[PDB]
Amino acid sequence: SVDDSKYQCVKLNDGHFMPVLGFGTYAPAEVPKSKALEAVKLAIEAGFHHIDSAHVYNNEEQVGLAIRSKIADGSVKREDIFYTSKLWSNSHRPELVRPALERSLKNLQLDYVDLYLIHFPVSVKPGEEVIPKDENGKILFDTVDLCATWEAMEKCKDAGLAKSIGVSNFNHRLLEMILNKPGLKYKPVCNQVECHPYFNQRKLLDFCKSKDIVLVAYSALGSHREEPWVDPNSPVLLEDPVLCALAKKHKRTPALIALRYQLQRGVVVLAKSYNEQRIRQNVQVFEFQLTSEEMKAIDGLNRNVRYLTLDIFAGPPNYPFSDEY
Ligand SMILES: NC(=O)c1ccc[n+]([C@@H]2O[C@H](COP(=O)([O-])OP(=O)(O)OC[C@H]3O[C@@H](n4cnc5c(N)ncnc54)[C@H](OP(=O)(O)O)[C@@H]3O)[C@@H](O)[C@H]2O)c1
């Protein structure tokens, strides 16, 4: 490694710096958790400085241990790790936001997260069930004002427990509601949403840019494809023939093309892998560049394919994916 003390970062609207390539940690239920531990250690070792998890992924104990293990063995300093967690929808009530963050931190054994996000804007009833249901099997939705959720998030930042705060799965209207909030103290630094060449989010992205909100792309390689979350007949992004042709031309891979596309359009990009080789491969995103004509060809792949509809949460007004953007 010629110089691993530096790496590519973007300045967020609160003055903190976010590494532009993030390691995704979600794995399907059939995968055991010891795997998350090793994969995060490998990611750190490969040069990932941004690590994305969430309370609901049920891996934070493992992800935390991997981070502390790599600090303790001298590979990395805490300040050169950007760690994201997320507030699950059964803790949107403002009184529960801080306890949920403290709980993440306790599982992690870290003093702070770098970023805390409202994970999804549809609230469900508080309690131990992450998806609470009634006698008829219907989800018990909760009526919570997310402005009040945001205010509690602001207090977490002021207490130092989250260096930065942001949102996920917010649409144009929901972001406006937060930006116009009475007494707003901190804008969200980011909106983490699904983004890839079949769903390139240009309209939402331009809106985010106009407000200096960074868009953070998940499922940027086409998603984990885990049923029932993702339909098995959705097209497989990484078999796209334009992506494959650019990959061959560049002597890279479809995945790397998909990742590089996001970097060049100003998006911070996540990439999940629990495989040694693919983990290292994904860091190659910084070793080549796409021309304007290649970026235009990738822009032309847009085709309204949303892998993660999360339509179990459809119905309430805060369900984000029924508006155009
Ligand atoms: N905020 C939200 O609602 C939300 C939703 C989804 C995800 N996320 C975050 O974003 C992350 C990423 O999204 P995602 O999990 O949907 O998946 P993703 O990153 O789009 O895609 C990852 C899949 O691609 C594979 N892969 C990785 N690198 C590859 C390469 N070089 N070549 C070929 N295949 C490769 C992985 O398999 P191998 O593992 O076997 O390599 C994995 O199955 C999550 O883990 C999570 O942290 C957030």
Ligand SMILES: CC(=O)[C@H]1CC[C@H]2[C@@H]3CCC4=CC(=O)CC[C@]4(C)[C@H]3CC[C@]12C
């Ligand atoms: C990572 C991801 O796409 C998110 C979207 C919806 C989330 C799921 C919501 C339902 C759920 C309930 C559980 O008890 C385990 C976690 C799961 C299985 C969640 C895993 C994280 C999911 C799958």
